[PDB]
Write a protein that binds this ligand. Structure first.
Ligand SMILES: CCCc1ccc(NC(=O)c2ccccc2NCc2ccc(=O)[nH]c2)cc1C(F)(F)F
Length: 265
């Protein structure tokens, strides 16, 4: 394939995490001695086409801030998708446990710009992530951040519309039109990017502080939004707010969001 490889070139170690379906384990590709991350599905998780669709899309992606595909075991079960191992783990715990003087507002801003560049790229490809949030972002050396997905992906491309059975979307990151009418697009990924910008600014606080899940949409619909986090620059907050525009089409594209970061500065 170019990508095909085989197990027992790989030692499977412990879990790193997973999502509604899919579990990711740390492992070693013995030969080239590299520690790697390998996603698997379960014995009776009948989501083959979904897993295959994730592997297929990943082969089309080449960007410095999108986790790197190394290979795949798709000729026979168990099927594996193998990517590089990101030394610092997920962005959400990184933020919650970090030395803030070292991970300061400027580093938060650079982290945001790197995610925005990954997204603009997905956007050119017409790929929709569908679960963008800090817990799905990963951290390498020297604050390097990359977008990834610990769950069996629910991505959608310009040719696909499927998802694994009972796919549930986290209310606090999911755009209104997506929750209420199941309408997903690049623009819903832009809404999620706004919430992630908010996670980054607050060092990984849980969104919509002081509101029950049951009121989130209703308040959104009445024009309430999360407030500017302490120390978050106004232009960064403005960008969050534009991402949270009610009408999907009034949200900026990822190309505009990246440009705004470039010209802030
Ligand atoms: C539009 C495409 C979106 C997309 C979907 C799926 C993946 N799939 C992974 O992210 C992935 C695949 C296989 C194994 C692990 C893994 N990541 C988790 C991890 C954890 C620790 C660790 O060390 N490494 C990886 C990515 C994307 C992407 F990147 F485009 F956004």
């Amino acid at each position: 394939d170019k990508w095909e490889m085989e197990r027992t070139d790989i030692t499977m170690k412990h879990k790193l995490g997973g999502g509604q379906y899919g579990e990711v384990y740390e492992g070693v590709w013995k030969k080239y001695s590299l520690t790697v991350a390998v996603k698997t599905l379960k014995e009776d998780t009948m989501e083959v086409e979904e897993f295959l669709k994730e592997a297929a899309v990943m082969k089309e992606i080449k960007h410095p801030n999108l986790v790197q595909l190394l290979g795949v075991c798709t000729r026979e079960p168990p099927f594996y998708i193998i990517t590089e191992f990101m030394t610092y783990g997920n962005l959400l715990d990184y933020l919650r446990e970090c030395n803030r003087q070292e991970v300061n507002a400027v580093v938060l801003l650079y982290m945001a710009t790197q995610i925005s560049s990954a997204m603009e790229y997905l956007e050119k490809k017409n790929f929709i992530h569908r679960d963008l949030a800090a817990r799905n972002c990963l951290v390498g050396e020297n604050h390097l951040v990359k977008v990834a997905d610990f769950g069996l992906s629910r991505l959608m491309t310009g040719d696909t519309y499927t998802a694994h059975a009972g796919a549930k979307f986290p209310i606090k990151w999911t755009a209104p039109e997506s929750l209420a009418y199941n309408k997903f697009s690049i623009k819903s990924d832009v809404w999620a990017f706004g919430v992630l910008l908010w996670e980054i600014a607050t060092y990984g606080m849980s969104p919509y502080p002081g509101i029950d899940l049951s009121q989130v949409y209703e308040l959104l619909e009445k024009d309430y939004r999360m407030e500017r986090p302490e120390g978050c620059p106004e232009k960064v907050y403005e960008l969050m707010r534009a991402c949270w525009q009610w009408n999907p089409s009034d949200r900026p594209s990822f190309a505009e969001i990246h440009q705004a970061f470039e010209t802030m500065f």
